[PDB]
Amino acid sequence: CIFCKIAQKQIPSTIVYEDDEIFAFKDINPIAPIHILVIPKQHIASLNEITEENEAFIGKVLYKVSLIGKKECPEGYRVVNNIGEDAGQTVKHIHFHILGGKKLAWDKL
């Protein structure tokens, strides 16, 4: 898993924030001027693997996403998560996108 390897610094990335639980890094193919990926260090494949037993942990991840977003994007930010084929999920390790740095489009998908 490329995201487990990035989180453990086996594959290089430009680190925005890291702690015992999460790892955040710049997206190398950005769609916004600020485009950050936030991953749990623990491998969970997608949002469809959230259970009642790990929902408190995923809430903590989302809280830490908000702390990164409000620091990096004081003018506002969008959080995106992709599940499966129609959403274009490329890596099967849950990753939140933080998008900001401009007035973001809201266009037909």
Q: Which residues are catalytic?
A: 95
Residue 27 binds its own copies, judged by CB under 8 A: no
Rounded to 5 degrees, φ, ψ at 92 are -85, 65
Residue 11 binds Zn ion, judged by CB under 5 A: no
Q: What's the CA gap between 35 and 104, in Å, rounded? A: 12
Rounded to 5 degrees, φ, ψ at 37 are -100, 135
When binding is defined by CB under 5 A, the residue of 32, 69, 89, 93 that contacts Zn ion is: 93
Hey, which residues between 83 and 102 contact its own copies (CB under 8 A)? 83-89, 99-102
Residue 67 binds Zn ion, judged by CB under 5 A: no
DSSP 9: T
C-alpha distances in Å from residue 51, one per residue of 47, 74, 79, 96: 9, 32, 21, 18
Tokens 């992709």, residue? 82
Residue 1 binds its own copies, judged by CB under 8 A: no
Residues 83 and 89: beta-carbon distance below 8 Å: yes
Residue 47 binds Zn ion, judged by CB under 5 A: no
Residue 2 binds Zn ion, judged by CB under 5 A: no
73 is in an annotated binding site: no
Q: Please enumerate, by residue number, every residue annotated as part of a binding site.
A: 1, 4, 27, 43, 82, 88, 90, 93, 95, 97
Q: Which residues bind its own copies (CB under 8 A)?
A: 31-32, 47-48, 50-52, 55-60, 62-63, 65-66, 69-70, 73, 75-89, 99-109
